A paper describes a structure:
The mMfa1 structure revealed that its C-terminus was partly located in the position where the N-terminal extension is expected to be embedded, based on previous structural studies of related proteins. The protein binds one metal ion, modelled as Ca2+ due to the high concentration of Ca2+ ions in the crystallization buffer.
[name] displays two forms of fimbriae on its surface, FimA and [name], both of which are crucial for attachment to other bacteria in the oral biofilm and to the host cells.
Author numbering: 64 to 214, 230 to 563
Write the structure that this text describes.
Amino acid sequence: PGEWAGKDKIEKVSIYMVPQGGPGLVESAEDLDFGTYYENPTIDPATHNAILKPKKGIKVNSAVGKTVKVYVVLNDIAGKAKALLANVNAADFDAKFKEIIELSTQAQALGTVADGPNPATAAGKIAKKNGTTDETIMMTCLQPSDALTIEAKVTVERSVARAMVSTKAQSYEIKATTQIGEIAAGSVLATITDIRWVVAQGERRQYLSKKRGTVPENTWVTPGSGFVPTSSTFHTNATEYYDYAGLWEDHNTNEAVISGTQVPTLADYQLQDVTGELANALSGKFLLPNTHKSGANAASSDYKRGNTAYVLVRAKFTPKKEAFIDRGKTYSDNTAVPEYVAGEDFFVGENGQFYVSMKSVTDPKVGGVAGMKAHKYVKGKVLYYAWLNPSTTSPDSWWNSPVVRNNIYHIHIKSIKKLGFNWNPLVPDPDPSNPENPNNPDPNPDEPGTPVPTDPENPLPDQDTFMSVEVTVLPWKVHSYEVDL
Ligand SMILES: [Ca+2]
């Protein structure tokens, strides 16, 4: 990436002076205009941190003569720190600075079609892209200054993580691995085009500043860390913790078209002066942290498909007409099977074969099977999951995927290898007894009793991979900001 990993704007500075030793009065200087009170950042080439040096003194008022610790929030642009910390006693302040803020309500965590293409997301409320120029992101200190007496330095880290996605190519050729209609193993089966992405299941709340856990399997805890969904509790409780509004980003109401944000190539990241829309894709997407107890297997890892942040990749799968086992045949009712038309719905049976309709799927005269179910791919839409931080890599072993603030998770797609899923079960359904779900852009299009493509109670890894990807975790160019006082 390089220059696309973010350039920061500091708009506001909030300083909290907290007397030590027991009950007492906090002195706060909130939402100070950065330019008025601070010099422009200078980078420490050793640490890659930026240092903010004050120009103007802040009035210490009642804290004069006291031993205090200093806490800092930069860019409290949603007012969340101010509101949480209001009228908090000095004795309660350190604990309060680690308590929970809510970026989206449980109701706001679910969007609908009317919220596209630019839905408010939880993380976007405290991480703003200012045109293509720079970005304003909330930051808080993991720990306050050392104790000092008024007559030091406070390091802060960004409150969001960033997801970035790239692809080797904008099209992929798919080969059959077994006989599919007239297509032999090793021959071309389909082409994938029009690749897009969104991110979901980051959290909707967060600890104001990073909160250490109690066991080594989860260094930093998040409000949702203890939530381990079953197939049923996912639907009733997932929105208590996670944000899904982002599923509607760059949504398109034409089902012939693939919804979501473009996925740039590596070369796109080297282009100078870029369109607005591509610039937005290149700078990625923000999400709030999401961690669970890590383990070495399904039983010991608390990371589940229904509680882990994911990138959803969407694309157009165009199969060769010759792949259809029903091609050229005659139905049991003595009518002819129509050839597949590119871009139209297609149906993939439990047997892996391709059919132009459900009528074909269950008619043995055309290579169907009575009683057999199929996945309906709506106008050829296919879906794939990528986890943000597979720990470790790479196929059937990435049991864990923590997302921690102030990190960038770059997912590079090297290839899409096979047919994906036809809908996204990793979205809470307010009435799970029916397939309708206005909160999901990719609801279940299948007939009753069709096997689900995946389940929220499942572990992360795939037995055999749908995509080849490499994930890189990196810091912002400026790792953290140091505020001098
Ligand atoms: Ca439903």
